[PDB]
């Protein structure tokens, strides 16, 4: 407002004039355009001359964050006790039970239902019921943790029963 502006100038899209040979060794290395042609990859961090100098600078400056992470871990390590985490021990016949049930039934290596003399082992994707690796480590750890928590609860119950018996003996003995 306040002035009758002319239409948008054609200078808003300047015509690019090729002053250099478009080398075939730079094929598609440039986004070609008649207005503002560009290199296919933009380097805003060009203050790092190379990618090796960039890696050196990144690892030199990331050392501060390594130190800060170490400080945070030490603070939480000298001031916090590991928690009682694991699978729900009230349902062990579920996720843990199904894993060992599948590894126990071995239904993937049975005989063919038509007598075709081929079992599950005759495939590129074949069952292996004696593998003992992979997620089995985590499954064993979860089962051990569940057993440990059950043992802790049992020990607590035994302790309270022992305390009650000791109190009954103490009060009854004195008379």
């Amino acid at each position: 407002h306040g002035w009758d502006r002319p239409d948008v100038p054609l200078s808003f899209n300047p015509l690019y004039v090729h002053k250099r040979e478009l080398s075939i060794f730079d094929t598609n290395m440039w986004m070609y355009d008649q207005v503002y042609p560009e290199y296919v990859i933009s380097y805003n961090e060009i203050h790092l001359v190379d990618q090796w100098k960039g890696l050196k600078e990144s690892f030199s400056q990331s050392a501060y964050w390594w130190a800060m992470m170490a400080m945070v871990f030490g603070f939480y390590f000298i001031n916090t006790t590991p928690r009682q985490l694991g699978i729900d021990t009230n349902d062990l016949k579920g996720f843990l039970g199904e894993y060992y049930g599948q590894y126990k039934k071995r239904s993937g290596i049975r005989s063919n239902f038509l007598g075709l003399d081929v079992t599950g082992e005759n495939s590129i994707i074949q069952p292996n019921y004696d593998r003992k690796n992979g997620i089995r480590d985590v499954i064993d750890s979860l089962n051990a943790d569940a057993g440990k928590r059950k043992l802790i609860n049992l020990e607590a119950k035994n302790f309270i029963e022992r305390v009650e018996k000791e109190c009954e003996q103490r009060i009854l003995k004195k008379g």
């Binding site: 002053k19 250099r20 040979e21 080398s23 060794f25 730079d26």
Partner: peptide, 17 residues
């Protein structure tokens, strides 16, 4: 090999349509 960033005169002898 790579393109030359230097400004060059337009070619006089080049393959054409």
């Amino acid at each position: 090999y790579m393109g030359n960033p230097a400004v060059q005169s337009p070619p006089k002898e080049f393959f054409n349509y």
